[PDB]
Amino acid sequence: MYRLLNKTAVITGGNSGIGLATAKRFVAEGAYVFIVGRRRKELEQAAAEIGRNVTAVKADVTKLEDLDRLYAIVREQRGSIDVLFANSGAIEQKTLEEITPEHYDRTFDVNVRGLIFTVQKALPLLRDGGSVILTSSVAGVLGLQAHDTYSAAKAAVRSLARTWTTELKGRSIRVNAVSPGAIDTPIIENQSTQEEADELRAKFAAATPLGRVGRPEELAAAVLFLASDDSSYVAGIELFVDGGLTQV
Amino acid sequence: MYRLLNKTAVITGGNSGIGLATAKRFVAEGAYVFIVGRRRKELEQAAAEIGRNVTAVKADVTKLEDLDRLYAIVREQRGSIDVLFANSGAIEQKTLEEITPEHYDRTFDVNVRGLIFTVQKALPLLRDGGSVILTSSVAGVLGLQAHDTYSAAKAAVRSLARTWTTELKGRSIRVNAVSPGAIDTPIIENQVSTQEEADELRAKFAAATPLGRVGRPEELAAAVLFLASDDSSYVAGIELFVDGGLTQV
Amino acid sequence: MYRLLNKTAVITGGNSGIGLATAKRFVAEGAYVFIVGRRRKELEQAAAEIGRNVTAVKADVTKLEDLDRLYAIVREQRGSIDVLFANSGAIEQKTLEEITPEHYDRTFDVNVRGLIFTVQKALPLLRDGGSVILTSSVAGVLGLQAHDTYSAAKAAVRSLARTWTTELKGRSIRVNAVSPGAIDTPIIENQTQEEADELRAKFAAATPLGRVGRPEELAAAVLFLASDDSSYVAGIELFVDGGLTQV
Amino acid sequence: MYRLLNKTAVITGGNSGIGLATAKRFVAEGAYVFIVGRRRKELEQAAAEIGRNVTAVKADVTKLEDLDRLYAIVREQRGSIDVLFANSGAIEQKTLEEITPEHYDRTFDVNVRGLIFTVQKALPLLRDGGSVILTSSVAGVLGLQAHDTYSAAKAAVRSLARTWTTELKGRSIRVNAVSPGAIDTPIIENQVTQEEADELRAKFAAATPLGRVGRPEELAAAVLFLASDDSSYVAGIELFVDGGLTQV
Ligand SMILES: NC(=O)c1ccc[n+]([C@@H]2O[C@H](COP(=O)([O-])OP(=O)(O)OC[C@H]3O[C@@H](n4cnc5c(N)ncnc54)[C@H](OP(=O)(O)O)[C@@H]3O)[C@@H](O)[C@H]2O)c1
Ligand SMILES: NC(=O)c1ccc[n+]([C@@H]2O[C@H](COP(=O)([O-])OP(=O)(O)OC[C@H]3O[C@@H](n4cnc5c(N)ncnc54)[C@H](OP(=O)(O)O)[C@@H]3O)[C@@H](O)[C@H]2O)c1
Ligand SMILES: NC(=O)c1ccc[n+]([C@@H]2O[C@H](COP(=O)([O-])OP(=O)(O)OC[C@H]3O[C@@H](n4cnc5c(N)ncnc54)[C@H](OP(=O)(O)O)[C@@H]3O)[C@@H](O)[C@H]2O)c1
Ligand SMILES: NC(=O)c1ccc[n+]([C@@H]2O[C@H](COP(=O)([O-])OP(=O)(O)OC[C@H]3O[C@@H](n4cnc5c(N)ncnc54)[C@H](OP(=O)(O)O)[C@@H]3O)[C@@H](O)[C@H]2O)c1
Secondary structure (H helix, E strand, O other): OOOOOOOEEEEEOOOOHHHHHHHHHHHHOOOEEEEEEOOHHHHHHHHHHHOOOEEEEEOOOOOHHHHHHHHHHHHHHOOOEEEEEEOOOOOOOEOOOOOOHHHHHHHHHHHHHHHHHHHHHHOOOEEEEEEEEEEOOHHHHOOOOOEHHHHHHHHHHHHHHHHHHHHHHHHOOEEEEEEEOOEOOHHHHOOOOOOHHHHHHHHHHHHOOOOOOEOHHHHHHHHHHHHOHHHOOOOOOEEEEOOOOOOO | OOOOOOOEEEEEOOOOHHHHHHHHHHHHOOOEEEEEEOOHHHHHHHHHHHOOOEEEEEOOOOOHHHHHHHHHHHHHHOOOEEEEEEOOOOOOOEOOOOOOHHHHHHHHHHHHHHHHHHHHHHOOOEEEEEEEEEEOOHHHHOOOOOEHHHHHHHHHHHHHHHHHHHHHHHHOOEEEEEEEOOEOOHHHHOOOOOOOHHHHHHHHHHHHOOOOOOEOHHHHHHHHHHHHOHHHOOOOOOEEEEOOOOOOO | OOOOOOOEEEEEOOOOHHHHHHHHHHHHOOOEEEEEEOOHHHHHHHHHHHOOOEEEEEOOOOOHHHHHHHHHHHHHHHOOEEEEEEOOOOOOOEOOOOOOHHHHHHHHHHHHHHHHHHHHHHOOOEEEEEEEEEEOOHHHHOOOOOEHHHHHHHHHHHHHHHHHHHHHHHHOOEEEEEEEOOEOOHHHHOOOOOHHHHHHHHHHHHOOOOOOEOHHHHHHHHHHHHOHHHOOOOOOEEEEOOOOOOO | OOOOOOOEEEEEOOOOHHHHHHHHHHHHOOOEEEEEEOOHHHHHHHHHHHOOOEEEEEOOOOOHHHHHHHHHHHHHHOOOEEEEEEOOOOOOOEOOOOOOHHHHHHHHHHHHHHHHHHHHHHOOOEEEEEEEEEEOOHHHHOOOOOEHHHHHHHHHHHHHHHHHHHHHHHHOOEEEEEEEOOEOOHHHHOOOOOOHHHHHHHHHHHHOOOOOOEOHHHHHHHHHHHHOHHHOOOOOOEEEEOOOOOOO
8 A cells, every 4th residue: 555646756856865765765665756966966866766756857956947947847747736845955164254255155055945836837737636845954953063053944844844834734744854864865975985974873872862873765664654644633833753863 | 654554552432422432533544443442332343443453442541450451361362562652541521720630630640640551550561662642732832721730731741741751762662642622522512511612622623723623633643653664763852742733722 | 228128028949059049039129029848057157148128948848838838937027029930849760651649749849739728728829910930841842761751740830831821811810930941050950960961962962052051041931920020921931941842 | 220231242132122211221231232223223223212321323233244344343342242222123024925146145234144143243252151032932832823934033042041051151251042033113113004014912911821022111111131141051042022921
């Protein structure tokens, strides 16, 4: 029994990590998935890795024209959207003294601005009864060295779920934020050394009660819950999938 | 597809409302379910309503001997516990001026004390990898007229999830709180006398909730099913609000 | 200046630690203070240490009769109550497997039950415009080894502030919870004195500000919630924990 | 008498509402105050209304050059900063469908970007032991019609307090967020008719347990707490001054 039989889903940043794992499980559950991202190469590989009911679209969420084009493709092909997973994101570690206007803009364009407009332009296609999902982060409720702009961006993403819960209740659409903890993705690697990238995993595992970094498939599933009708009476929440990290 | 295939679950207060709906969906998902409660009549009717892989046990959670007996029955029959749903509860509306020592005790015995000991005595039977679930309430994060003791009890239940997340991580057991909002159960009916003024209470909580309706027990069951399942395998210590947005503004 | 000039305050557990420091600063600010507690010895020493506008009353908050007697004394002497500081409390460290019904009762009687009734019986004496204050704990939003009942009790105390904010708004009374982090009091000692410094070193390591709080620093935060500076502050949870819970 | 005797304070958006009331009470408590804002007229009137130990500086917080100039003036005159009150802010009500890139930028430039950089450039002047204060809003923890960007910005401001608590603990500096509820200021007037501005007040008074809109002087005081040594063991918090509104 497929928990998303025939639902159409749109996943932003679906060619890697969380989005990709969520794309797999979604397809596995019988959905049609549009994976969105910038890298052509990784979009195709993802589309291959999934093998079914996926189309891969190239689009930069910081660009209004790329998003307009995305949603045009969505209507040609699947017509409406049951589930939206605003999951594009990135981090640059910089402390307060190091913050430049460009760093601020780079961080907030993809993480917040981009997000905002991907949900805005999906609106005409969203079916009433639809579920939207925003990826924030445990960073949104913590004070971490050099996460200044990223944490603040993610805190802003969670706030958008509250607001959109109010603005869209009139169409029976649920907007929810998922806040991953430490999930094993390329995002840990890309913040230089791969010796000191394992320092970062060992640290976040030490910190988390469950004593391990999360798997992307475990975030996929939590997102699947909020996507499914099992979460039919769940709106506006912040779901922590962090092994207990923020829960003490 | 059976998301709890062959998992043994124990549901406290499983002869009514939330526990019962959660018992159904659990069985539907291929589990074995022990529904616990005080009323003999409603236990049997529930056991009938479910129709399979259920056994109904009579036990008052405020009584240590009833719990000891419960877990003895569990050990005979299914041997171990994969999922525990501490979901027994009740409310008496009383304001601060009205609070009596008995009212305080009644409220806290079932809601907190009982809860505490049902999880304590399940411990030897819990499989590592197991999932425990505590039913608190949006009341835990709100200031509602005459919910003084109930809200405080529920706030305490949520705290136990944090603590037990730390104490039991060494056995890979997840403890999570679910906080329902306004779910259509006999708990709304049994506070007030009139059934005209019990609909006033539903209309009020529906007005308050973004989604504009009282929750269905089957919708709580499902959220509890999530926390019960492996889909929530990296989710510990949380407070899951299933309240249609009520506390999320 | 004297930010509590002529206000009458009642402090529960005022013969030690947080209550005592809060009693000093309160008096310093020109209030009349009733310090409440069980130990006769420590009540008198506190009453001496303060030196002015204090009366010390013996009362166990788990006893209804001791509370009835307390508020009778308050009436005789100062007549009404401007500020109430429900600050009695205690902890026994026990894990889930160790929890006994007695341990559960002991913890919840003082921390919650007692608290509940001290605010109930103060009600007739509270002036409209009054401020009530409840002492919970960072424990209320954390999962600490062996703090099962204490943390849960404190989480319940914070909930009572939300409720009482609603129930008493009609009399313009503010109810607020203060949640201390690690404040240097006898509560750390009474849970070896070598392994009591292990507990301080651990909570200082954990807290951004890198140190255990002083009781005088809690007193002041409680003084804020007591004063008119916190006129438009109701139902809150004020963390005075050096950042501990914030991350 | 005088809880800020000889402390130098810098207040951003100090020619009106919250900042101005906070400027008065600060001066009343024996501080030196720099009130910052864009309007020349209102800066002078504020400087007059206060009457003592104030200097008024014209500066747009969205402009790096205006901030550099501000802190140069501060160096000339008082040399160091004991208390910083990042309190500049503004709101435009727009729902999700109405959000334009410009509206997004306008909102986030003052409320977040500006804020970020006013704290960055104060850093060299801040005395160890200093207290920073950020003005967010109950909006940060709520889902209000048409508050999309403002609420999200304010949610981000609160996040910066957590982070800066970690980053600056090494200099014994406390960073705290204050989240006002409904305070009687020109910010209510300037969104909307003055008939339909007094509703907005009736609505927020209805909502708040204490049954009234807050006074600016009552926010000033709460900010004075966080400014003073009475809050010497208080870092990283979110202080709600909302009459109970968000505390249910
Ligand atoms: N692991 C953790 O600790 C953690 C914690 C909390 C939240 N998260 C969140 O999880 C999300 C994504 O997964 P990940 O970060 O773990 O792995 P990742 O492999 O870094 O995923 C980032 C995804 O975002 C996409 N992306 C970035 N900028 C984009 C743009 N302008 N337009 C479209 N797509 C864009 C990437 O694709 P392209 O670069 O190819 O466009 C990629 O698919 C992020 O929002 C991140 O903040 C991770
Ligand atoms: N309905 C809501 O919206 C809502 C909101 C927040 C929380 N809750 C929580 O939901 C749970 C109950 O479900 P419900 O309220 O929806 O339906 P309900 O009919 O009120 O369920 C109460 C359950 O607890 C059992 N119970 C009470 N005291 C007990 C004891 N001493 N020992 C064993 N069982 C006991 C009841 O059965 P017996 O009478 O046979 O013992 C019944 O099965 C409670 O934990 C309640 O606080 C409900
Ligand atoms: N230090 C921390 O880390 C920390 C953190 C969070 C909260 N707190 C809270 O702060 C409060 C008090 O200060 P403290 O505990 O740090 O110092 P303490 O010296 O342990 O203070 C406890 C106070 O409570 C009183 N008390 C206990 N049971 C009582 C009863 N039945 N009736 C009257 N008084 C009673 C004690 O006096 P008698 O023994 O004479 O009765 C004493 O005055 C407690 O509620 C505690 O939960 C402390
Ligand atoms: N009133 C409420 O209900 C409420 C609730 C939550 C938070 N707040 C916050 O309280 C703060 C301000 O006080 P107010 O809002 O009550 O009244 P207000 O009169 O709107 O205050 C806004 C202040 O910020 C200044 N400002 C705006 N844009 C600026 C810029 N680009 N550069 C420098 N200064 C700028 C204004 O001065 P110029 O116009 O002269 O530049 C004025 O001094 C804001 O942070 C607001 O978000 C208010």
